[PDB]
Each structure stands twice: as structure tokens, then as C-alpha cells.
Amino acid sequence: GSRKKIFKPEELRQALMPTLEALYRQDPESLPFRQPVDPQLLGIPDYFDIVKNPMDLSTIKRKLDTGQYQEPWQYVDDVWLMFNNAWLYNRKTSRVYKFCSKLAEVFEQEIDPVMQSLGYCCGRKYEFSPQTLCCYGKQLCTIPRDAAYYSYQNRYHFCEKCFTLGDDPSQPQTTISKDQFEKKKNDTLDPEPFVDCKECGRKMHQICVLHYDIIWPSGFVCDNCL
Numbered sequence: 001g002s003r004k005k006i007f008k009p010e011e012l013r014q015a016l017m018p019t020l021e022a023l024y025r026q027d028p029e030s031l032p033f034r035q036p037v038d039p040q041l042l043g044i045p046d047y048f049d050i051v052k053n054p055m056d057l058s059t060i061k062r063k064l065d066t067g068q069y070q071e072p073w074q075y076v077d078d079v080w081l082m083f084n085n086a087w088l089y090n091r092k093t094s095r096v097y098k099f100c101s102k103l104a105e106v107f108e109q110e111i112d113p114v115m116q117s118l119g120y121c122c123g124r125k126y127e128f129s130p131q132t133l134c135c136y137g138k139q140l141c142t143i144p145r146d147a148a149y150y151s152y153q154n155r156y157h158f159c160e161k162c163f164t165l166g167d168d169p170s171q172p173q174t175t176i177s178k179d180q181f182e183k184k185k186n187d188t189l190d191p192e193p194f195v196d197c198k199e200c201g202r203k204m205h206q207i208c209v210l211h212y213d214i215i216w217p218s219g220f221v222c223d224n225c226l
């Protein structure tokens with residue numbers, strides 16, 4: 001009897017379908033996304049080499065219609081899987097890529113009040129900005145958002161101007177082949193991390209619900225469960 005919130009299918013369908021309809025309403029931008037990708041019909045036979053888990057509006061609608069989502073973040077995840085597949089497969093200059101970006105703008109403007117009506121802090125999946133990275137070359141030096149840099153193992157980073165590795169003064173350093181590195185751009189957004197309400201079990205964002213002047217020695221409890 002731990003007060004876990006169980007979402008019934010009709011609750012999720014009634015709340016979330018208007019956000020899906022807002023995407024469907026976009027003409028022309030929803031047109032590439034209204035049906036499952038058919039690589040042979042479209043003439044893109046390499047599609048499933050790149051996209052391992054396809055997703056589209058019709059599949060999301062069917063999942064809502066048949067109760068396949070236990071909680072609304074799974075719906076949010078499917079919407080972003082659809083977007084991320086298209087941003088990966090298609091070139092930035094292509095119409096499908098640009099249409100995807102329009103759909104994502106619409107979704108971000110629709111999802112927060114809907115998720116709030118379901119008891120959540122908001123519906124935003126990703127952090128607002130790429131995290132600032134540390135540059136190994138200098139001590140002061142850091143890599144800001146949208147900056148170019150080099151990275152081995154997604155661990156050790158050098159800004160391009162600075163570009164014998166170690167992560168601690170006592171750690172014996174190792175020589176790594178320069179240009180074993182990959183050049184990257186600091187433009188990736190990570191998912192906003194969660195904390196679960198210990199009563200209802202809802203996943204809430206740490207940044208949304210945990211404040212600099214509040215402690216939770218016995219565990220986080222959301223506003224509606226207090």
C-alpha cells in the first residue's frame with residue numbers, strides 16, 4: 001500500500017492525444033511522419049542500417065489507443081525517438097530534417113501543461129544547454145556550448161587551440177596517440193535527470209523539484225503527495 005500512481009489507459013489517452021493531434025495538424029511538416037517508414041517504397045534501402053528502432057505518429061497513436069504506455073514519459077520518449085531518428089537519418093539541409101525540427105518546436109510548446117495536468121513538473125525531456133566541458137591543456141580552460149573540440153573515449157577533451165593524459169595528480173599518465181581523438185562539437189543536449197517521488201512514484205526532474213535551500217533526508221515527496 002505505498003500509494004503508487006497507476007495511470008489508466010483512458011487517462012493517458014485523453015491527456016496526451018491533444019499533443020499528438022497538434023503534431024498531426026502541421027501541414028506539410030507532419031506528412032513524412034504520419035505513417036511507418038517503408039524503406040523500399042521510399043527508395044531508402046539503408047534506412048534500417050542507421051535507424052534500429054523506428055517510430056512514427058501512427059504507431060504512437062495506436063499505442064495510446066491500446067494502453068501500451070504505463071506512464072506518460074514513455075509517450076514522451078517515443079515522440080523524441082521519432083524526432084531523433086529523423087535528425088540522425090536525414091541531412092540538416094533536407095526537407096524531412098527541417099520538418100522534424102518544426103514538429104519538435106510544436107511539441108515543446110504543447111507538452112508542459114499536459115504533463116502538469118498529469119501531476120508532473122513539466123514535460124521537457126532534454127537539458128536546456130550542453131554542459132560546459134573541461135579542457136585538459138590549461139587549468140583555467142573550459143569548452144563552452146557549440147564549441148569545437150577533440151575527444152578521446154568521450155573522457156579527455158581539448159579545445160582546438162590547445163590541441164600525456166591523466167585524471168589525477170597521483171595517476172600514472174599514459175601516452176595516447178594524438179589523432180586517436182575525434183573532433184566534435186559541444187552541441188549535444190543530455191536528458192534532464194530525474195528523482196522519483198517516494199509516495200506516488202512519478203519521475204520528476206531534479207532541477208524542477210529540488211531546490212538549493214531544501215533537504216529531503218527521508219526522500220523526495222512531490223507537492224501533491226505532501
Ligand SMILES: C[C@@H]1CC(=O)Nc2cccc(-c3ccc4c(c3)c(-c3cnn(C)c3)nn4C)c2N1
Nearest residue numbers: 028031032033037042044085086089090095096
Ligand atoms: C521519416 C521518413 C523517413 C526518413 O527519415 N526520411 C525520409 C526520406 C525520404 C522521404 C521521406 C518521406 C516519407 C513519407 C512522406 C514524405 C517523405 C512526404 C513529404 C511531403 N512533403 N515532403 C517534402 C515530403 N510525405 N510522405 C507521406 C522520409 N521520411
Ligand code: NA
Nearest residue numbers: 093094095098
Ligand atoms: Na527547405
Ligand SMILES: [Zn+2]
Nearest residue numbers: 121122205208
Ligand atoms: Zn520538469
Ligand SMILES: [Zn+2]
Nearest residue numbers: 135141159162
Ligand atoms: Zn583549452
Ligand SMILES: [Zn+2]
Nearest residue numbers: 197200222225
Ligand atoms: Zn508524488
